[PDB]
Amino acid sequence: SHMRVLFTPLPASSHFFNLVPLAWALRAAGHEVRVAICPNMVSMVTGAGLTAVPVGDELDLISLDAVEQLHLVDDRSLDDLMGFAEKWQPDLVVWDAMVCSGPVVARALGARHVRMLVALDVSGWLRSGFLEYQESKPPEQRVDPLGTWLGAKLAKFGATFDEEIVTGQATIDPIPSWMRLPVDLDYISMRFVPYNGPAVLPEWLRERPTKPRVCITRGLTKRRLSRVEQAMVERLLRGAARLDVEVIATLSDDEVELPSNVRVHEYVPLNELLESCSVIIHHGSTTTQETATVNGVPQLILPWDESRRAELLADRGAGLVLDPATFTEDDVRGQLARLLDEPSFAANAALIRREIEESPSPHDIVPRLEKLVAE
């Protein structure tokens, strides 16, 4: 192997999935890749065929001092990682934009670090707002709580603060260029490649449909909590079925009696499904969204700023939006009917898809990173 690469993803499937392909792209180049993950999400990682370094105490990131844990930057955890990291000596850490964990270790270690977005650059945009204001102030008042508080963890390992710890040496952007918030950083445009958990293709998913297909999903991380109202889905699902189509609703144990043209599963490999859908209806989250977008499928979204990206997608003519408060089954139907009927969306979605499939693939990104490590 040339490079030893460490990933520090947030401990939740969507945030993790969004790392998988690049992880492998790298692997396929011949670099060693490890994924650092709290020891209860271990088999998530192993599941994507990647090697998992359990680190810290268990964490039910969903159910969630307490502020520290969420971003993997608390004492208990960081130390373990740092402990391995120290021993392991990666040349590069690629880190989910919501954990501080990995850049702390990176600076402590001197290894290049790269932030990867699973959403619009709020952190960086905001952070940008700030740096500029703080700018004009009386130098003695140039406060920076985020920075200093970090410098303290940082100092724990003989490291000092840098702007870099907040936004990384680079930020890899998988949401499409046009959608990307204006904020003057070094952005690396990567084509989103879908990984949707473990994918098995059952027989029924092998034939062309015979009525136009509709997908109705909310990925895991949302819905799933629940676990310990509700109403909107049965609304969406009722409204949807009013139209002469097969609705695949991807649901957990919960209800209810359903329309005849509606079939329900706990998990179906979405990407695969979406090759055969005519319209997707989803809840604005991001891995779900691009799998849709990346598959040319027109969209019906019920909303990061899940609104904003869904608004942005609306705008460019590949989808529409309802308001989760004021929405009635009618709007569901009528909206769906538009998406399925006026072929602009079908079209507008394809142009966006063609666009997407010409941004650099993960595979295309690898050398751009080796390049970065050689500097």
Ligand X SMILES: Cc1cn([C@H]2C[C@H](O)[C@@H](COP(=O)(O)OP(=O)(O)O)O2)c(=O)[nH]c1=O
Distance CA 29, CA 366 (A): 7
CB 226 within 8 A of CB 254: yes
Q: Which of residues 78-107 bind its own copies (CB under 8 A)?
A: 83-84, 87-88
Q: Which of residues 230-269 bind ligand X (CB under 6 A)?
A: 250, 254, 267-269
226 binds, among its own copies, ligand X, none (CB under 5 to 8 A by kind): none
Helices marked H in 316-361: 329-341, 344-356
Angle at 363 between CA 34 and CA 297, to 5 degrees: 105
Q: Which of residues 159-198 bind ligand X (CB under 6 A)?
A: 196-197
Task: Tell me: is residue 270 an annotated ligand-binding position.
Answer: yes
- Provide the CA 341 distance to its chain's centre, in angstroms: 30
Task: Tell me: is residue 148 an annotated ligand-binding position.
Answer: no
Count of chain residues binding its own copies (CB under 8 A): 48
Q: Is 297 in the site for ligand X (CB under 6 A)?
A: no
Distance CA 94, CA 22 (A): 10
Distance CA 167, CA 116 (A): 9
Closest CA to 6 of 43, 55, 40, 39: 55
Nearer to its own copies, 23 or 119 (CB): 23
3-class DSSP assignment, residue 323? coil
Read off the tokens for 78: 């960081």
CB 352 within 8 A of CB 293: yes
> What x-and-dash track marks residues 53-82 binding its own copies by CB under 8 A?
xx----------------------------
Distance CA 33, CA 359 (A): 24
As measured in angstroms, the least distance from the Cβ of 302 to ligand X is 12
Distance CA 321, CA 293 (A): 15
Task: Tell me: is residue 222 an annotated ligand-binding position.
Answer: yes
CB 50 within 8 A of CB 35: yes
Long-range contacts of 130-136 (CB under 8 A, 24+ apart): 131/163
Pick the binder of its own copies from 15, 113, 153, 191 (CB under 8 A).
Answer: 191
Residues 6 or more apart from 371 whose CB is under 8 A from it? none
8 binds, among its own copies, ligand X, none (CB under 5 to 8 A by kind): none
Q: Which of residues 18-47 bind its own copies (CB under 8 A)?
A: 20-22, 24-25, 27-30, 34, 42-43, 46-47
Task: Tell me: is residue 287 an annotated ligand-binding position.
Answer: yes
Read off the tokens for 155: 């100092």
Pick the binder of its own copies from 3, 12, 41, 48 (CB under 8 A).
Answer: 48
Nearer to its own copies, 199 or 372 (CB): 199
Task: Tell me: is residue 160 an annotated ligand-binding position.
Answer: no
Residue ranges at the known binding site? 14, 196, 218, 221-222, 267-268, 270, 283, 285, 287-288
Q: Which residues contribute to the site for ligand X (CB under 6 A)?
A: 13-14, 17, 196-197, 217, 219-222, 250, 254, 267-270, 285-288
Q: Which residues contribute to the site for its own copies (CB under 8 A)?
A: 1-2, 20-22, 24-25, 27-30, 34, 42-43, 46-54, 83-84, 87-88, 191, 193, 195, 198-203, 206-208, 269, 271-272, 357, 361-364, 366
